[PDB]
Design a protein around this ligand. Structure first.
Ligand SMILES: CN(C)[C@H]1C[C@@]23CC[C@@]4(O2)C(=CC[C@]2(C)[C@@H](c5ccc6ccncc6c5)CC[C@H]24)C=C3[C@@H](O)[C@@H]1O
Lengths: 339, 266
């Protein structure tokens, strides 16, 4: 600007910490996606030897996603939610960088390692679930929805002070009018039926999906590439078709008459969560199963909340959850490959 | 709404409730050109500018209020000469509307609103048309965000006010006036110096006194620092005397010419 004060401008330019002077991250890219570019980085002044994650947000300037991600992360503080350490605004190229502590692991890679075979240890699974629930409860208590929960957004810290601690990452930033209108595996039936807003219950559905995926190593609602027919078909092949009594307000959903046109109850008559989970060697009289079933309730008003799930007697049955998901045992999962 | 119960661990509480004496020391830079009196008149004026930009864009009061707070935070640290407040004002609305989940207000629409509001509602202060393009708004936005240390979630008195009048059972009687008085407190430093619920309580006290409503007992049953509430009441009461004695329309051109000027590059 020509009508901005020169002294003010050059003073700020002199003091401005630039990402590329502070951090070595050249060719250390670990993620590329709709989030943007995520690098494993090191501080160039050798003050600390910690690993950091540097995310360059997709796009330039201050978009809604960018604006709201910064706004919320600046306020949110909980052990199970990823902490924003610093924000770099690069003035030349109008790029926003965000700094986080580096999480060596995540549930996409952990589950896929187990699926490459050893099923996930039962102690670790419960601890993962407890910390996901703890983190989501904190977000929900603050009226913050994630809106995109899935294994790849559940980070787990590696060796260092926070060994085996879940960090929930990349909250669904953002959605215009809080409205949803290629992965459909973690989406609640009501979204698939044309629900017009995200809710706490939608997050809770995703958590049940994750929990089932931890117990079996298979995504419970795996399906091929709003209303998606085959995704709904898969839910019903697992869960059965909901009776009128199980989900009374299903008639209120915008895509309900489409569901009636395309589907018949009788197709899914010998289908239930019980029979699915028994084929994957999980007992239907287990506290695990009973908790899972409450999470995977079809009618969103009959799904338990995060707080009720944390109170579940599953977490009082031996073994107790631990702060370190790996329970002091050696971590067999490989470190992140660079791109 | 996002972060509603978290005021006590918020960036607003921990970073942006300021010491009054720190505030006034930083203000001395600008007081070499303007009197105290003229400085508070500028603040009122730009408060009204932001209001007008907001009404024109059809934004809710909370968006306007957040924008107003961003403007105040910036000039709490920095001189009026550092960035033209004529540029900062529509930049603050623009950023606030993206925080508060309304939308990225169209560029042509933001620029059209600033042009239109200054022309039609503020021609007494500005002879020339709004001279900034969108690329200037975009530049200013980066500087604004950096200064506020990316603190974007702001808490306002409207929410607690509403809870207090519901509690009293006098939403019909007092809410219109108390809400209006909350709007008026944005013409002062109060939002930089006091938690929002305290400003709410002071505005509600004044509304009750204006309407001859006895709420002594209801106020006595609060577990709150009543000296601070009285401090806020006084600032409100003085604000209305200031308003009475101020002709914005006759005085602001002169006061705007006294502002210190952004130095050009060599
Ligand atoms: C393309 N597929 C191979 C999957 C790739 C994957 C796995 C983990 C991830 O890339 C990711 C999201 C963000 C991750 C985890 C990156 C990431 C993102 C943010 C981080 C913050 C702190 N520490 C570490 C962080 C790592 C690293 C790998 C990325 C999501 C996916 C899946 O959607 C693809 O199907």
């Amino acid at each position: 600007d020509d009508k901005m004060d020169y002294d003010f401008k050059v003073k700020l330019s002199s003091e401005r910490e630039r990402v590329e002077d502070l951090f070595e991250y050249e060719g250390c890219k670990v993620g590329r996606g709709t989030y943007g570019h995520v690098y494993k980085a090191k501080r160039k002044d050798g003050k600390d030897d910690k690993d950091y994650a540097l995310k360059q947000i997709e796009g330039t300037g201050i978009s809604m996603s960018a604006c709201r991600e910064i706004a919320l992360l600046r306020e949110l503080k909980h052990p199970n939610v990823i902490s924003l350490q610093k924000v770099f605004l690069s003035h030349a190229d109008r790029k926003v960088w965000l700094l986080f502590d580096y999480a060596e692991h995540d549930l996409w890679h952990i589950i896929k390692f187990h699926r490459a075979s050893v099923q996930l240890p039962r102690g670790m699974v419960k601890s993962l679930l407890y910390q996901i629930l703890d983190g989501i409860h904190y977000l929900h208590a603050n009226w913050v929805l994630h809106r995109d929960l899935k294994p790849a957004n559940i980070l787990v810290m590696g060796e260092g002070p926070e060994r085996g601690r879940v960090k929930i990452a990349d909250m669904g930033f953002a959605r215009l009018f809080n409205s949803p209108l290629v992965t459909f595996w973690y989406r609640a039936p009501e979204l698939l039926l044309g629900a017009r807003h995200y809710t706490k219950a939608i997050d809770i559905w995703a958590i049940g999906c994750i929990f089932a995926e931890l117990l079996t190593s298979e995504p419970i609602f795996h399906c091929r590439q709003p209303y998606h027919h085959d995704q709904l078909d898969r839910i019903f092949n697992v869960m059965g078709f909901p009776a009128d009594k199980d989900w009374e307000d299903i008639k209120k959903m915008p895509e309900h008459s489409t569901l009636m046109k395309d589907f018949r109850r009788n197709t899914y008559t010998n289908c239930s969560l019980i029979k699915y989970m028994e084929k994957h060697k999980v007992k239907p009289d287990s506290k695990a199963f009973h908790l899972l079933q409450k999470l995977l309730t079809m009618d969103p008003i009959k799904r338990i909340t995060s707080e009720q799930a944390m109170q579940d007697p599953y977490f009082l049955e031996d073994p107790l959850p631990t702060s370190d998901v790996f329970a002091g045992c050696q971590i067999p999962y490989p470190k992140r490959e660079f791109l | 709404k996002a972060m509603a119960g978290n005021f006590w661990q918020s960036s607003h509480y921990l970073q942006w409730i300021l010491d009054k004496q720190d505030l006034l020391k930083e203000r001395q830079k600008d007081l070499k050109f303007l009197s105290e009196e003229e400085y508070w008149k500028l603040q009122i004026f730009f408060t009204n500018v932001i209001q007008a930009l907001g009404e024109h864009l059809k934004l809710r009061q909370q968006v306007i209020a957040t924008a107003t707070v961003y403007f105040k935070r910036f000039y709490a640290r920095y001189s009026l000469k550092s960035i033209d407040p004529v540029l900062m004002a529509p930049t603050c609305v623009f950023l606030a509307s993206k925080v508060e989940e309304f939308g990225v207000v169209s560029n042509t629409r933001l620029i059209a609103a600033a042009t239109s509001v200054l022309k039609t509602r503020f021609s007494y202060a500005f002879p020339k048309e709004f001279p900034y393009r969108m690329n200037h708004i975009l530049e200013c936005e980066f500087y604004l965000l950096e200064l506020m240390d990316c603190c974007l979630i702001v808490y306002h008195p409207y929410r607690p006010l509403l809870q207090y009048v519901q509690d009293m059972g006098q939403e019909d009687m007092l809410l219109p006036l108390a809400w209006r008085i909350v709007n008026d407190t944005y013409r002062t430093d109060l939002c930089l110096l006091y938690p929002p619920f305290m400003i709410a309580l002071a505005c509600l006290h004044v509304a009750c006194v204006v309407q001859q409503k006895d709420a002594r007992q209801w106020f006595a049953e609060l577990s709150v620092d009543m000296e601070k509430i009285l401090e806020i009441i006084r600032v409100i009461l003085k604000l209305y005397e200031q308003w009475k004695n101020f002709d914005e329309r006759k005085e602001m051109a002169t006061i705007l010419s006294k502002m210190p000027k952004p130095k050009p590059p060599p």
